[PDB]
Amino acid sequence: SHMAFASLIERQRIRLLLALLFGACGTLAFSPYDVWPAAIISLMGLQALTFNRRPLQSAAIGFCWGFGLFGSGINWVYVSIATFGGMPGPVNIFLVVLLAAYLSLYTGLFAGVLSRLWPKTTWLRVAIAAPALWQVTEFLRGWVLTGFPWLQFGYSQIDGPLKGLAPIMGVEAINFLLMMVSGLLALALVKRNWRPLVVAVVLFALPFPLRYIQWFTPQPEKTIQVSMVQGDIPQSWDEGQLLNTLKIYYNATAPLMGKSSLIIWPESAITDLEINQQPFLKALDGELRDKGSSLVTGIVDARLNKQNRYDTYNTIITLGKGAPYSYESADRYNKNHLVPFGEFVPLESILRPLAPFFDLPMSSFSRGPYIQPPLSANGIELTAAICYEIILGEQVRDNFRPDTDYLLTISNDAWFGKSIGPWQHFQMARMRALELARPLLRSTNNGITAVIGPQGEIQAMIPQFTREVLTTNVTPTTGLTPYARTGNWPLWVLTALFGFAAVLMSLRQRR
Ligand SMILES: CCCCCCCCC/C=C/CCCCCC(=O)OC[C@@H](O)CO
Ligand SMILES: CCCCCCCCC/C=C/CCCCCC(=O)OC[C@@H](O)CO
Ligand SMILES: CCCCCCCCC/C=C/CCCCCC(=O)OC[C@@H](O)CO
Ligand SMILES: CCCCCCCCC/C=C/CCCCCC(=O)OC[C@@H](O)CO
Ligand SMILES: CCCCCCCCC/C=C/CCCCCC(=O)OC[C@@H](O)CO
Ligand SMILES: CCCCCCCCC/C=C\CCCCCC(=O)OC[C@@H](O)CO
Ligand SMILES: CCCCCCCCC/C=C\CCCCCC(=O)OC[C@@H](O)CO
Ligand SMILES: CCCCCCCCC/C=C\CCCCCC(=O)OC[C@@H](O)CO
């Protein structure tokens, strides 16, 4: 003789469950599902479920929304933990839950702050304040503790109607517009009002023609045959296994010398120190040179520094024509942004004085500088990034030079097997080529090797989980996109105006 289904607390629990499901729906926006409308459905839920809530209730809803998104969208990290971590399966699940909860603090933060300063359900909350605040809370997610900016809905528009915005203001401009349009749709829905819907449709539609702009010019007098060797080496300290790996890569490469101007091996393809492989590298250099070809490859470089310690780098080196190999050559690239929990553990430097020496890792990776020159091979300028680094759009843009001919990324996504992880990673890699209007050569161990065209399109690809070479003709491009010239500071100016205007109005609403 009561209505327990209609209590205030129960209505809030219903919102938390829906938030969970609307968050998870957003995972469908990303590869390999590639249902870009799901990003709008997922953000509509976020914006609508937080209306007419107290701030702490809104924060809970935003946390649960994020938990659905990250819980369903980056649980592929389990595959690495469970295969290589040595830990009990329940510990592995809990670590993944912990990761998803951590990232959901930033969506709860967004929701809580939005509710406190813009409690009324209005077009200002959703179209002006929310985009600005989402930009700030997502920057923090990608910055705190080195950051993890995985699953930004703008990437889901690589093959969508908003892709033309990315070469002008970067992918974060697409995150901005999507939040704004999804908020206007949520507003139209709850107030049953057609005016915010029309506005939303116009704003969503205005960018459509930009997708037809080519900010670049092709250079066919520079077209070359490029080869990328996907060795598909399983994950491993055996010098024999090392030699079996050099055998696969060398024998796949030898018939391409004299035909492919550029040959590419993936991240850490040579699984030995550069100092222990001088005879191999200098012989290889000579074969490539005598046939007019160049080789770029990943390798681990423990380089003795002036303190007579070893900096261990995750490195790219060059050999052959136009890139004479040398241990002292500057024609190389050292990974700058290490993978959190992969190549380091955040907060480790603070805790190290107390750790027993026998428990510390044998070797830990050092960091190359934030800016490094393009690699040069066979006359070709290559702006390089290793693995996770390709998802850092501003950093890729900061290393880019107008004379860059190609973006280069080499990676090893074998850690995550047959999960959606490598596909999401591949999708973000495509956004860099669109933003900077250059082809991107992505060479991987077993995990989406491909040539991406200067508008983010897949020009060539080989299947995952195959030992095989991708060989094709590639053409470099020149020209500066607006985003390449400026970076993201124009979006920040817009964010500051939107946010200034919204905060001013919220303070006026009070007192
Ligand atoms: C029918 C209504 C009553 C049953 C449903 C109860 C209300 C909640 C349903 C939705 C749950 C929201 C998701 C919670 C997210 C966090 C989580 O579960 O644990 C993560 C943990 O690591 C946090 O520290
Ligand atoms: C080629 C041009 C492409 C760019 C189009 C991007 C559109 C988003 C940029 C900024 C838009 C300004 C904000 C307008 C929001 C106004 C608003 O929410 O009004 C709703 C209200 O009238 C409903 O009753
Ligand atoms: C207060 C609670 C503790 C601090 C806050 C939680 C922080 C997030 C917790 C994350 C735990 C581990 C996440 C999985 C890492 C997976 C991994 O190593 O991937 C990279 C690796 O495969 C690269 O070779
Ligand atoms: C550990 C100190 C206190 C807690 C802070 C840790 C959490 C903040 C830093 C972010 C962690 C993200 C964890 C997942 C990263 C692993 C991952 O992406 O694997 C590499 C993969 O992306 C390469 O394609
Ligand atoms: C962030 C919210 C949604 C997006 C709002 C912004 C919409 C921008 C629409 C497009 C504007 C075109 C910008 C001017 C580009 C022309 C220009 O710079 O010409 C010189 C060119 O060579 C630069 O590379
Ligand atoms: C008010 C209307 C009713 C609420 C529910 C409708 C909107 C949200 C849709 C519900 C759930 C989303 C499920 C899709 C995401 C799951 C998914 O693909 O996960 C894949 C991933 O786990 C693979 O590792
Ligand atoms: C890695 C450590 C994660 C700790 C997660 C604590 C939250 C547990 C979630 C349980 C129920 C849902 C309601 C949570 C509301 C508060 C919240 O999570 O975030 C609030 C946000 O303002 C944080 O800045
Ligand atoms: C596990 C993915 C479930 C897809 C269905 C979406 C609707 C349910 C709620 C959304 C996401 C899962 C939330 C719990 C956290 C996920 C987690 O720790 O998973 C670990 C496990 O999947 C690793 O294999």
Numbering used by the authors: -1 to 234, 237 to 511
Paper text:
A novel monoacylglycerol, 7.10 MAG, has been produced for use in the in meso (lipid cubic phase) crystallization of membrane proteins and complexes. 7.10 MAG differs from monoolein, the most extensively used lipid for in meso crystallization, in that it is shorter in chain length by one methylene and its cis olefinic bond is two carbons closer to the glycerol headgroup. Two distinctly different membrane proteins, one a β-barrel and the other a mix of intramembrane α-helices and an extramembranal αββα sandwich, as well as the α-helical adenosine A2a G protein-coupled receptor (A2aR) were crystallized in 7.10 MAG by the in meso method, yielding high-resolution structures in each case. These findings attest to the utility of this lipid for future campaigns aimed at the structure determination of novel membrane proteins and complexes.
The second is the lipoprotein N-acyltransferase, Lnt, from E. coli. Lnt has half its 57 kDa mass as an α-helical bundle residing in the cytoplasmic membrane, on top of which sits a domain that is a mix of β-strands and α-helices in the form of an αββα sandwich. Compared to AlgE, Lnt performed equally well in 7.10 MAG with crystals measuring ∼50 μm in maximum dimension growing in 4 days at 20 °C. The structure, obtained by molecular replacement to a resolution of 2.19 Å, was of very good quality with just two residues (235–236) that could not be placed in reliable density. Eight structured lipids were modeled into density as 7.10 MAG molecules. Two MAGs are found stacked one behind the other in the binding pocket leading to the active site and are taken to mimic the acyl chains in the glycerophospholipid and lipoprotein substrates and products. Arm 3 is a flexible loop (His337-Gly368) that helps secure substrate molecules in the binding pocket of the enzyme and is often not seen in density. In the current structure, good density is present for essentially all of the backbone and most of the side chains in this long loop. Several residues (Pro340, Phe341, Gly342, and Pro346) in the loop are found stabilizing the 7.10 MAGs in the binding pocket. Crystal packing gives rise to an arrangement wherein the N-terminal transmembrane helix of one Lnt molecule sits between Arm1 and Arm3 of a second Lnt molecule, further stabilizing Arm 3 and contributing to the defined density for this usually flexible region.
